[PDB]
């Protein structure tokens, strides 16, 4: 490979970061770090307050982007998602929230952390006390824009006009726009809602989005009625959006961009049509849900960033259908298409339950079913090659593939899929405006040690040396290396014998070759990726280390508390990460 400059490292099970020879890692920032001058220190006992957590780096850091600081080669901003929190570590009692203050403290953990980093003696470090440092959390005041802003379904007792919402939370992954803004994606937002009525009736749209009376072991609703569907059912509609943040304006109000649709958003992959309009590819991470694409009405104004204020409020949302492909077991290839989600088109109208375009967007999942989108094996991150524009999407796994309604075929080639696969497409004419594409499975993950010579052994670019499961995050670097991050089963047993802890790998898009680059600590997943502009630092997240009680990473104090961290990975010889020595 021209691209892969390091030797594939062994799988590992240690409570450490493992890297190739000549590489090193440092903690950039961890959950609980105060952001502001004289801010409250992290308290490992759990006794930190909600108010303190609102001014500290959030928990479970996830997707992130780095923004070059105009005029300053040795400064940058990073916007980093904080997806959820770990009650065993958050509270001294280690259990469910017990009060309104406990619920406020959990909401404080989630959202986005904007931080400044500065380079000193070659190394990037967090700058506490920067005027740019900011928490946006689950109680922050946000705006709603786009076609669904002000709709009846978006109004609540607290917000009678449907344009002002408290919080972004369950922030999974990210996008970075060419007009200098950050997109954060609300994914498992429904988990946070419940009802004081255990026998709560839910309507078909509520059921399709997966709300329950119990909540998903979040249990905010007993103390914060905003999350109690018996009282505030339309609050469910005011989350599940892509939210746009200006990291360079620390007093700006972030905006929920309803034109991009409501669903369990993983990330938001930016591209541009040949005629200059913005394109955002988006996955909905749930078994049997869909892949989407938004194309703006307006051209991006590259020279005048602020002129793009409303660009994500106008345009067209599409959803994918994939054909059956050619059935090749190692490397299936086919065609697919984008289908418009527009009131009055493709059978989307009052007769199929949509009064207007706002409802199409609020209930995008339902609209996409009407038009016959292809049910997918848990779409997670999407990236677009900077070299050739080809688009890659992880399909992390789907244990229910093969069940009635989720047939095996095309880009979902295995029943009871525990390993996942990476889907690629090439938009027609290499124009992201096109409504058709060619697709192929770039890799089918598997375990060829345990399941040699069967579909569970994976595709031929998987070997016993490099094998992994449940690819999730993705990132390209400027050279065109594809970085693959995992959130899989870390048992190192059974179907996963030999795979070890979660990990990051690097792939050559042209050749299909994959090499293991990093292994993370016990109980984590590896998520979030950004590069310095010079490509000599790779920033990567280690999320929920010790989720089941087996880690003290990164500090390794005796009987210590593990902390989600952003790591900085560099070469000892100062060269470009991933490249030859
Ligand atoms: Ca993920
Ligand atoms: Ca995942
Ligand atoms: Cl198709
Ligand atoms: Li994530
Ligand atoms: Li996970
Ligand atoms: Na740089
Ligand atoms: Na653990």
Q: Where are the domains of the chain?
A: 1-581
Nearest ligand, measured from the Cα of 123:
6
313 is in an annotated binding site: no
What are the structure tokens assigned to 81, written together?
A: 């998602």
59 among the known binding-site residues? no
* Ligand 1: centre distance to CA 175 (Å): 14
Asked whether residue 289 is marked as a ligand-binding residue, the answer is no
User: Hey, which residues does 292 pair with through a beta bridge?
Assistant: 282, 319
Ligand 5 centroid, distance to 525 Cα (angstroms): 6
Q: How far apart are CA 187 and CA 241, in angstroms?
A: 8
Q: What is the DSSP letter of 56?
A: B
CA 423-367-343 angle, to 5 degrees, is 125
Number of helical (H) and strand (E) elements in the chain, helices listed first: 6, 30
Taking Cα atoms as reference points, which of 467, 464, 410 lies closest to residue 441? 410
Q: Ligand 4: distance of its center to the CA of 226 in Å? A: 25
Contact (Cβ atoms closer than 8 angstroms) between residue 483 and residue 492: no
Ligand nearest to the CA of 325: 3
Give the 3-state secondary structure percentages of the chain, helix then strand then coil, rounded to 5: 15, 35, 55
Phi, psi (5° rounding) for residue 263?
A: -175, -175
Structure tokens, 214: 């119990």
H-helix or E-strand spanning residue 101: helix 100-109
> Residue 240 CB: number of other CB atoms within 10 A?
24
β-sheet bridge partners, residue 323:
none
Contacts 24+ apart (CB under 8 A), 457-461: 458/419, 459/330, 459/331, 460/330, 461/512, 461/513, 461/514
List helix spans (H) across 441-532: none
The whole-angstrom separation of Cα 483 and Cα 505 is 6
Q: Which residues contact 420 (CB under 8 A, 6 or more apart)?
A: 377, 378, 394, 395, 396, 397, 445, 469, 470, 471, 488
Nearest ligand, measured from the Cα of 541: 4
Q: How far is the CA of 527 from the centre of ligand 2 (A)?
A: 9
The first and second tokens of residue 265, run together, are 């958003």
Please state, in angstroms and rounded to a whole number, the distance separating the CA atoms of residues 73 and 487: 33
Q: How far is CA 414 from CA 185, 230, 306, in A?
A: 29, 40, 47
Nearest ligand to the CA atom of 539 = 6
Residues with CB under 5 A from ligand 4 (ion): 62, 172, 527
Ligand 2 centre to CA of 91 (Å) is 25
How far is residue 83's CA from residue 520's CA, in Å, rounded to a whole number? 18
> 537 CA distance to ligand 2 centroid (A)?
24
The Cα 509–Cα 484 span in angstroms is 12
396 CA distance to ligand 4 middle (Å) = 11
Distance 574 CA to ligand 3 centre (A): 47
User: What would the two tokens of residue 200 be?
Assistant: 């709560």
CA of 535 to the centre of ligand 1 (A): 23
Q: Residue 67 to residues 99, 118, 177, 253, 461: CA-CA distances in angstroms?
A: 38, 12, 10, 19, 34
Gap from CA of 353 to ligand 1 centroid (Å): 31
566 vs 59: CA distance, rounded Å:
11
Our CA dihedral for 67, 70, 72, 76, rounded to 10 degrees, sits at -20
Of residues 278, 275, 263, the one with CA closest to residue 319: 263
**Does the annotation flag 266 for ligand binding?**
yes
The reply, when asked if residue 285 is annotated as ligand binding, is no
DSSP 8-state code for residue 228: B
Structure tokens given for 332: 């299936």
Q: Report d(CA 455, CA 160) in Å as an integer.
A: 54
d(CA 528, CA 112): 13
């Amino acid at each position: 490979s021209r691209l892969l400059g390091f030797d594939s490292i062994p799988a590992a099970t240690t409570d450490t970061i493992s890297l190739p020879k000549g590489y090193k890692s440092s903690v950039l920032i961890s959950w609980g770090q105060p952001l502001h001058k004289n801010g409250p220190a992290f308290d490992p006992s759990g006794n930190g307050t909600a108010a303190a957590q609102e001014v500290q780096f959030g928990d479970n850091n996830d997707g992130m982007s780095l923004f070059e600081f105009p005029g300053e080669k040795n400064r940058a901003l990073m916007a980093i998602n904080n997806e959820y929190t770990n009650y065993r570590y958050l509270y001294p009692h280690g259990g469910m929230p017990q009060s309104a203050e406990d619920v406020r403290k959990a909401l404080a953990c989630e959202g986005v952390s904007v931080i400044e980093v500065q380079r000193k003696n070659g190394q990037w470090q967090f700058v506490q006390g920067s005027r740019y440092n900011r928490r946006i959390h689950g109680n922050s005041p946000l705006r709603i824009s786009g076609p669904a802003a002000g709709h009846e379904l978006m109004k609540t007792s607290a917000d009678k006009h449907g344009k002002k919402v408290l919080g972004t939370f369950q922030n999974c992954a990210n996008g970075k726009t060419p007009w200098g803004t950050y997109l954060t994606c609300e994914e498992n937002f429904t988990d946070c809602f419940g009802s004081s009525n255990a026998q709560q009736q839910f309507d078909p749209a509520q059921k399709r989005y997966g709300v329950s009376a119990a909540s998903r072991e979040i249990n905010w609703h007993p103390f914060d009625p905003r999350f109690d569907m018996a009282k505030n059912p339309n609050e469910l509609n005011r989350h599940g959006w892509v939210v746009e943040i200006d990291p360079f304006d620390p007093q700006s109000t972030p905006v929920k961009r309803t034109a991009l649709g409501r669903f369990k958003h993983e990330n938001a992959a930016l591209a541009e049509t040949d005629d200059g309009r913005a394109v955002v590819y988006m996955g909905d991470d749930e078994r049997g849900e869909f892949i989407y694409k938004f194309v703006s009405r307006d051209k991006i104004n590259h020279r005048n960033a602020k002129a793009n204020r409303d660009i994500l409020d106008h345009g067209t949302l599409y959803v994918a259908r994939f054909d059956a492909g050619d059935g090749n077991p190692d490397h299936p290839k086919g065609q697919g298409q984008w289908i418009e989600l527009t009131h009055g088109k493709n059978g989307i109208d009052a007769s199929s339950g949509f009064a207007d375009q706002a409802e199409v967007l609020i209930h995008a999942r339902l609209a996409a079913s009407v038009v016959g989108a292809t049910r997918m094996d848990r779409p997670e991150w999407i990236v677009v090659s900077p070299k050739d524009g080809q688009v890659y999407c992880t399909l992390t796994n789907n244990a229910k593939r093969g069940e009635d309604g989720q047939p095996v075929g095309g880009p979902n080639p295995r029943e009871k899929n525990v390993y996942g696969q990476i889907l690629r497409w090439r938009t027609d004419r290499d124009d992201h405006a096109s409504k058709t594409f060619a697709w192929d499975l770039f890799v089918v993950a598997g375990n060829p040690s345990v399941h040699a010579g069967t579909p569970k052994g994976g595709s031929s670019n998987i070997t016993p040396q490099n094998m992994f499961n449940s690819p999730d995050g993705l990132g390209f670097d400027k050279a065109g290396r594809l970085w693959i991050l995992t959130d899989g089963d870390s048992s190192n047993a059974g179907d996963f014998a030999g795979m070890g802890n979660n990990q990051m790998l690097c792939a050559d898009p042209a050749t299909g070759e994959i090499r293991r680059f990093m292994v993370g600590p016990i109980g984590c997943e590896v998520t979030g990726i950004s590069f310095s502009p010079d490509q000599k630092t790779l920033f990567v997240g280690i999320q929920h280390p010790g989720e089941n009680g087996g880690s003290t990473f990164p500090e390794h104090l005796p009987n210590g508390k593990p902390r989600s961290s952003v790591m900085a990975i560099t070469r000892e010889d100062g060269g470009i990460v991933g490249a030859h020595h």
